[PDB]
């Protein structure tokens, strides 16, 4: 892999992880709100 590609690649992984983080945090606050 080139320096560029590996940078892009690592960067995409970081983003994907952030997006998952937000989804799971939202999900968690939602389950806490809707559950008895």
């Amino acid at each position: 892999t080139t320096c560029a590609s590996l940078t892009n690649k690592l960067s995409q992984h970081d983003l994907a992880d952030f997006k998952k983080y937000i989804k799971r945090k939202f999900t968690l606050m939602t389950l806490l709100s809707i559950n008895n």
């Binding site: 892999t1 080139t2 320096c3 560029a4 590609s5 590996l6 940078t7 892009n8 690592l10 960067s11 995409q12 970081d14 983003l15 994907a16 952030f18 997006k19 983080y21 937000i22 945090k25 939202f26 606050m29």
Partner: protein, 186 residues
């Protein structure tokens, strides 16, 4: 902490995009991705908006400065908006991650990896004719419970993705050498 971004896109456009997305992404925030992400290339990128090329969306540290940047890169627009953004780990301190290689240190840029989602946008100011028209319009989709007490990403996480070109001096210097991607080390 709050960060600020002067942008030529209207709140309706942002809503449709799901946030402030980078120039290379065509789908809503949660749907697509920038075709190429590179912090170094992004900080150097110069059209019709403030820096948002190469997978990142530029933000700065104050309203005053976002405004100055607005008058500078968006002068020529009869109207634009300054978005108030809550701190989170998708924001990287450009001056801190790129060191002495930071192209525009005066901008105090905090680069948002992949853009800023709508729920992270606290509100916005409307700038008509170079003047801030009224107060901040609170974004109803802002989710305080998701962003309360978060802060920008630590520099260490940014060194690994600094993106300097292959064989650039930085890859042979501390701190970057210690975090460089294999294929970037000399």
């Amino acid at each position: 902490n709050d960060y600020f971004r002067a942008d030529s896109r209207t709140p309706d456009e942002v809503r449709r995009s799901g946030g402030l997305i980078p120039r290379g992404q065509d789908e809503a925030y949660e749907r697509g991705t920038p075709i190429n992400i590179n912090l170094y290339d992004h900080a150097r990128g110069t059209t019709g908006n403030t820096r948002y090329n190469d997978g990142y969306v530029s933000t700065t540290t104050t309203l005053r400065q976002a405004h100055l940047l607005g008058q500078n890169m968006l002068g020529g627009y009869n109207e634009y908006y300054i978005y108030v953004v809550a701190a989170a780990p998708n924001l990287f301190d450009v001056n801190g991650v790129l060191g002495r290689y930071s192209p525009y240190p005066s901008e105090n840029e905090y680069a948002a990896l992949g853009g800023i989602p709508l729920s992270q946008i606290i509100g916005w100011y409307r700038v008509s004719f170079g003047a801030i028209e009224g107060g901040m319009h609170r974004n109803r989709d802002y989710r305080r419970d998701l962003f309360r007490g978060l802060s920008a990403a630590p520099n260490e996480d940014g060194y690994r993705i600094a993106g300097f070109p292959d064989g650039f001096p930085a890859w042979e210097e501390v701190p970057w050498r210690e975090f460089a991607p294999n294929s970037c080390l000399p």
